[model samples]
Target: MGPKRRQLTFREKSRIIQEVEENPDLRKGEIARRFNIPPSTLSTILKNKRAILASE
Candidate 1:
């Protein structure tokens, strides 16, 4: 594989954040799987959830 990486858009990040908040009973890993994104990526989104929520 190449060194290229996937960068999520603000919209996508917003969606992910919303999904997490909507599914409090589900594990973060499951949410990640639903979005077909890496768990680590989901972790990062949550880590910066405030910023994402504050953005457009």
Candidate 2:
């Protein structure tokens, strides 16, 4: 499969960021699958968590 990224909104990003923090025991990949989003996408979102929180 090739790259096909989805554009997640700031709200969604904030939700995910909070989820990541809330579930610190869970791995990033596992969380991504639960949310039906790509692992890389989750990683990117996590990386920009500060920005996402600021936007909220």
Candidate 3:
């Protein structure tokens, strides 16, 4: 089996989300690499973030 699919901590989620807004030029792939998170996993995580990160 490959390395386990790691989950990002809540703190990282907040940071990553903010990073995307501030650095809109960064593509998903680049954001994933910058955070050391797998591209696939990064996408899958958005659903989870919805629970804690709701906004107007």
Candidate 4:
């Protein structure tokens, strides 16, 4: 069987959005490093949620 997918919570998404906005020059790798999140996971969050960016 495949590994279970981990879902992100609203709080986590809010935090990620804040980090990205606060550090506009930060790369995905940097964000991942700072947040201890996987690069692919961060990328998926950014891609999947436009409201996070738009609402900012």
Candidate 3's displacement at residue 33, Å, is 1.6
Q: Which residue runs does candidate 2 get wrong by more than 4 Å? A: 1-5
Candidate 4 local lDDT, 1-56, one digit each (tens): 22123345656666775676567677875675566455656667766666555665
- TM-scores for candidates 1 onward, in order: 0.67, 0.67, 0.53, 0.53
Query: What does candidate 1 score on TM?
Result: 0.67
lDDT tens per residue, model 1, 1-56: 32113456666667777887687688886777676465766778877898867754
Candidate 4, residue 24: CA error in Å? 2.2
If ranked by lDDT, best first, what sequence of candidates would result? Answer: 2, 1, 4, 3
* lDDT for predicted candidate 2 compared with the true structure: 0.69
Which has the better lDDT: candidate 2, or candidate 3? 2
Q: List, residue by residue over 1-56, the lDDT tens digit for candidate 3.
A: 23225565666666666665466566765676575565666665544656567762
* Predicted structure 3: clash tally: 0
Overall lDDT per candidate, in order of appearance? 0.69, 0.69, 0.59, 0.61
- CA shift at 29, candidate 1, in angstroms? 1.3
Report each candidate's C-alpha RMSD, comma-separated, in the order given. 3.9, 4.0, 4.8, 5.4
- Candidate order (TM-score): 2, 1, 4, 3
Kindly report which residue stretches of model 3 are placed more than 4 angstroms away from their true locations once superposed: 1-5, 45-51
Q: 56, model 4: CA deviation in Å?
A: 12
